[PDB]
Design a protein around this nucleic acid. Sequence first.
RNA 1: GGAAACUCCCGACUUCCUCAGGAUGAAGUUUCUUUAUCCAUACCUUGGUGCCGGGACGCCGCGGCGCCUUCCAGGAAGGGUUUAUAAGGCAACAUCGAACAUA
DNA 2: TATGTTCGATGTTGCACTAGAC
DNA 3: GTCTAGTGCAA
Length: 1211
Amino acid sequence: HLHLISAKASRKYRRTIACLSDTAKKDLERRKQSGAADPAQELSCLKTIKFKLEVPEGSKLPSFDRISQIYNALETIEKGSLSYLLFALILSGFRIFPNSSAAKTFASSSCYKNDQFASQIKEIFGEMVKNFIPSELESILKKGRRKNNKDWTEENIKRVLNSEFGRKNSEGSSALFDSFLSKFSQELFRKFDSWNEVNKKYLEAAELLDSMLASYGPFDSVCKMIGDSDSRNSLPDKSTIAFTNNAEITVDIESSVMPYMAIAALLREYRQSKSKAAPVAYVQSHLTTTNGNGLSWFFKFGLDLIRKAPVSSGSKSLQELFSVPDDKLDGLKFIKEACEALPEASLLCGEKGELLGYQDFRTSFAGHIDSWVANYVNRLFELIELVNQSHSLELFEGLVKNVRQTLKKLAGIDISSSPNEQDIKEFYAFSDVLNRLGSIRNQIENAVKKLKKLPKLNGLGGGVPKQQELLDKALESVKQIRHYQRIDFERVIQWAVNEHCLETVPKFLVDAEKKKINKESSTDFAAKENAVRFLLEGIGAAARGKTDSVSKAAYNWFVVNNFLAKKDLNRYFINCQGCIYKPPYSKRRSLAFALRSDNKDTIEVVWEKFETFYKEISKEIEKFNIFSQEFQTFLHLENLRMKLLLRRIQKPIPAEIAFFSLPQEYYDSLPPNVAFLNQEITPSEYITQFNLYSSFLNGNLILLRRSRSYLRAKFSWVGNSKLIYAAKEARLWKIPNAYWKSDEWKMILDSNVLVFDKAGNVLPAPTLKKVCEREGDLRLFYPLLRQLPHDWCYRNPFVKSVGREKNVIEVNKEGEPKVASALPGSLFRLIGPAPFKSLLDDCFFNPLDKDLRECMLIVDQEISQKVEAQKVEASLESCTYSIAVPIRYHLEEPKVSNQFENVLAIAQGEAGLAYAVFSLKSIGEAETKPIAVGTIRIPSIRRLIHSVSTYRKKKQRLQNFKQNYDSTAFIMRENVTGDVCAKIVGLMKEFNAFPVLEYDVSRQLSAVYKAVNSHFLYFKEPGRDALRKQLWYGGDSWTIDGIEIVTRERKEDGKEGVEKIVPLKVFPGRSVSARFTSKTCSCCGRNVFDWLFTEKKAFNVNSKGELTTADGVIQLFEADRSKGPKFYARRKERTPLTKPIAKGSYSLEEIERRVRTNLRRAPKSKQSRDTSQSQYFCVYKDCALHFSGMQADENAAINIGRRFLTALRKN
RNA sequence: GGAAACUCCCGACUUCCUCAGGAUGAAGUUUCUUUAUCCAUACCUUGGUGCCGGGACGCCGCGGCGCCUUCCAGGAAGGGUUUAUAAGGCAACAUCGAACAUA
DNA sequence: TATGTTCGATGTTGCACTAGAC
DNA sequence: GTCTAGTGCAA
Ligand SMILES: [Zn+2]
């Protein structure tokens, strides 16, 4: 038919296109002038693939608890976790730096008089120079250079020094310091023969520098300084940590709030140092330390060493230069404690395995931490300004300012004290307080500033959840919630009894109902039938659909008591459609059922009837599980009754009576609905606060009713990028005969790599060995290696595949095959389909195209909860080990260049999508004739619409234990979303066009459309952008040469700017405001909205219904009455509009509905999958759609095309 | 668009198409589709299918049956309706806010 | 405003080179 | 020649 590209072909089309993006073109250009292309300096993207790993059984795999334990070491902020220690370190008076050198200088702060020297430098050079202080000077000389920075030419030396000193390329400039670097650089080139020699001989270099400087001015001896600090260094070799006397120590403090202080402590110093950097970045520099570099020693050598030596006795006293008294030694005790507490690294090891250490996780750990640091620090600042910019009120002001100190001290801006744990507690409480008052705000506002709540202070967490413990808490939570449920229920009714305020138990509805219908309606007949409905519906709802005892039981009630016809009951109950009670003066009125004429039950009776029934199930529910389908239903009934029971009160309630008497442990937060307990008598408002128990009850109930879940532990370690290429040893390969006609394979036989079976069947493992050893580029056999039966596997992270012989080849990051030794039963086989596996190959054989990146090991332990001992107990089920391997598509390859000629206009039908293509060439007023037009199926859509209104139970799929809400709905949208973009992508290829899509305006369905737009159109928001780049392979924008478009921005207060034209850029899609794209006609070219407005601002229908317009003659029709009501239904043809309407004179509005009704007519057959008004015809007798018909999508598609086209009043 | 099915909901236990490549050929102006061995082993989704079960609607002589039409006396011309050539896949963690809806 | 559902979004990781000791 | 513990390099 018109079959579009899908799968690999579309991935190829999209990727190719990426390469044609504006940036990519730039990159290629750069290569001409640049010559060599950097992998990291060109467009790329990451494509992650997950492969479960087929670990062979008979492997020494650890218990999940053992696996679980480590993971927690890594991610939890409790004592015995890395986060604590890092926190302990700062808290307990220490500092972490990226390198060893910066550490030594810091400690020996005294030896280097940076303050004066800079002072002097300014006077003499008359400008402050970046990083030109003795302290920093020492590191620079001492530091080493890599890559092409090592080249020992005068120029390179100057280049580096320039950069280090923030000196700009000013050759012509006769700057005092600029000309000093040249002299210095020039005088350094001369006297040392390499950079490596410069580091070794660092006082000589220091000297020289001081010597040169001597000529310009009087400066102290750097080298002396260097020697001086050098003499006093006590620090362990390469320590990236140091102790500060100026620091404040806060040992033995709360784990929950420790993070708060360290950030605060560091933040405070940010100010002392008068740093120019952002606060967010100052702490990340100083906490984690620049790529986990600080922790590389600290987690491996600093940890080891800090357990083995004693705080004071080399004694960790002189090594870290502690206070001689114990002014600040309380500090070492807290960190010494932190180190032993952290368990030694365990059970994860490298190849030829030896255990991995905490230093191997520095990158990820730092990323986790710094992410939080960014977020938390941003909060405070938000908080402070948040603050800066009825006894309780008394409390606020008094208590408000104290909040400033909390925020300020937290932020490190107050040196009055370092924040107390209580400081923290106060903040929330205040939050507690402000919030109430805000509501009060709203309290008298509907009678007729924002003391709005303030945001939370962030926290950190992590580690596998304790499944059993959490479950048990729920169980106890549930028992207690029910228990206290009753008491609040019992007492309030009891209170009512004494004050005798109870309304008629069943009158309530009648009264309440009757209030709804604002009219006489005889005495009490019109409102009592509807009162009988209501009871039925409510109780009707609980058991409709369910197949439990109670549900069927309820059904029986309806059956025995004969409220409705059997057919009727079934449809309500069994088929699950239609309803017992219609809201009066219903706007939809979807054929309200007929309660049986015969039954003569009275409203008072039903409640007595129902009440009796209710009693029955209550006896029964006693024999069932709390977590049960039956109980679930009963609760539904119980709530209705209980509320109805509660609702029968005509007087307000005493606060002491209704106080929601539930302990705190069992619950957490009450929304704002419940922000009260002067003026607290609540007129029938106990219902909502009352509803809490159920909702609260429901949450725990859900958790315990969930049969399956999984817990996840994930690990990412530097250097975990090695995937292994192994041969399928057990198989015999019959190379096809026709393989030898190609020169390559011809070449293969000669090399004698191959080893045959007596039968002439190649043996893979044996042959594999040959290929490894035949000296040279392995690349010779890459083609064979791609054909030779092989498997991609991964080494067991816990055991040691030492290796005696070179079994297989192992592949790294940029394609780095390395003949390694693989043991038997030591590899895990990656499990995935062909396309997936193939990429893995490409990563090996073809690195420039794509290469492997660091992977993540994910261990999902699946647990399942089941009921025993009248409790829910969880038991471990299956463990799956998976590997997520990022694939970097360097791409950065070009093909035969091209551009978009046509345009793709897209419209979305609710049962698919429609398009229209226009040529770039036809840019004149006339001839905007669409090259092509059509529609595409896309079934998912109807599935989405048709499911959301059905409200069916979401598909059960394993959920993380952490997740407490269903994500089933989300995934589907993601899916539906995919197919929609696919087609557009598909269409795009054929027509070499770039799409134009309507801004949005079924609501579930809109969510997806919103998303679809994310993929093509340009948006700033990171989420929207991220989606796009995924599709277009990191591509940014494609600009069409020779075309451009008219833009119209705004200035201020919604004011029109100016019509400016610029070159046209498509991302690869652009947008158009679809204002009544649908109303207008594609062929006609005339909207109907014109007289719409014109007439509204300031009626001669004919016999068949003709109207005098400005632009033609609009012929409005009514339901044809030619053959009778019963018949069309007979064929199912929907009663077409062939019959005219002529009432002589019509209202302004009347035609509006008429025309409304008149254009988007519906479907030909009743048995359509379309309910939407799929068809629209231009009204004029002129338009060809009048007699013919069209699809709204195509039409709208066209208008859309045309409208956009006008814009590009460019060439 | 090739080949197929036939009213319409809600539920219950089975089968799995498609999939990335390598040396070939036979044809059809730098492409289109066929076909041989051969490596790649099939992950996560959206799905499809077979099956019972509980029901419903539109006719009809509590029960039979099921897309509308029309012509030979159960059969030949037409209409519609629905589709599988399946479709998608960038991971992870921690944080924060509320966000939509339904009558 | 009220009845029940749910996502929406920020921030971070998915380093690479080599002097000196294994 | 092999490896890892340091930390520079691009930003
Ligand atoms: Zn028209």
